[PDB]
Amino acid sequence: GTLEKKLDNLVNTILLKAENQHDVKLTNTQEHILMLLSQQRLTNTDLAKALNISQAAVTKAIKSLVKQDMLAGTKDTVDARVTYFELTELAKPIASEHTHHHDETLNVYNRLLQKFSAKELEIVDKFVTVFAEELEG
Amino acid sequence: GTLEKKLDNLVNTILLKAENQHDVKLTNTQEHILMLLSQQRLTNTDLAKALNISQAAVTKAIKSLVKQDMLAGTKDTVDARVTYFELTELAKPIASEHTHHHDETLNVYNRLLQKFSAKELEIVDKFVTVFAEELEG
Ligand SMILES: [Zn+2]
Ligand SMILES: [Zn+2]
DSSP code per residue over B11-27: HHHHHHHHHS-------
Say how many C-beta atoms besides its own lie within 10 A of residue B124's C-beta: 23
Query: Chain B contacts of A14, Cβ < 8 Å?
Result: 11, 14-15, 135
Give the technique used to solve this structure.
X-ray
Put residue B92 in one of left, alpha, beta given phi > 0 → left and psi -120 to 50 → alpha.
Answer: alpha
Annotate A16-31 with b (16+ C-beta within 10 A) or e (fewer).
Answer: bbbbbeeeeebbbbbb
A84 forms beta bridges with A74
**B30 CB within 8 Å of a chain A CB:** no
Q: Is B22 annotated as belonging to a binding site?
A: no
The count of C-alpha atoms lying within 13 angstroms of the C-alpha of A94, restricted to the half-sphere facing its C-beta, is 23
A73 forms beta bridges with A85
Annotate B64-80 with b (16+ C-beta within 10 A) or e (fewer).
Answer: ebeebebbeeeeeeeee
Q: Give yes or no for a contact between A31 and A61, defined as CB atoms under 8 angstroms apart.
A: no
Distance between CA atoms of B92 and A38, rounded to whole angstroms?
44
Candidates B14, B124, B136; nearest CB to A135: B14
Question: Smallest CA–CA separation between A128 and chain B, in Å?
Answer: 7
Please, what sign has the CA dihedral across residues A116, A121, A123, A128? positive
Residues A82-91: contacts with CB under 8 Å, at least 24 apart: A82/A43, A83/A43, A83/A44, A84/A41, A84/A42, A84/A43, A85/A33, A85/A37, A85/A41, A85/A42, A85/A43, A85/A44, A85/A47, A86/A37, A86/A41, A87/A34, A87/A37, A87/A38, A91/A34, A91/A65
Put simply, the answer to whether A110 touches B51 (Cβ < 8 Å) is: no
As a dihedral over the C-alpha atoms of residue B93, residue B96, residue B97, residue B99, rounded to 10 degrees, the angle is 160
- Chain B, residues 42-101, CB within 8 A of chain A, namely 51-54, 57
Question: Smallest CA–CA separation between A121 and chain B, in Å?
Answer: 8
Q: Say what angle helices B28-39 and B44-51 make with each other, to 10 degrees.
A: 120
DSSP B82: -
For residue A71, give the nearest of A111, A33, A115 by alpha carbon.
Answer: A33
* CA B93 / ligand 1 centre spacing (Å): 33
Q: Give yes or no for a contact between A126 and B121, defined as CB atoms under 8 angstroms apart.
A: no
Please state the domain extents for chain B. 1-137
Residue B43 main-chain phi, psi, to 5 deg: -90, 170
Distance between CA atoms of A128 and A135, rounded to whole angstroms?
10
Put simply, the answer to whether B10 touches A54 (Cβ < 8 Å) is: no
What single string gives the DSSP state of each residue in B31-48?
Answer: HHHHHHHHHS-B-HHHHH
Length of chain B: 137
Q: Give yes or no for a contact between A42 and A73, defined as CB atoms under 8 angstroms apart.
A: no
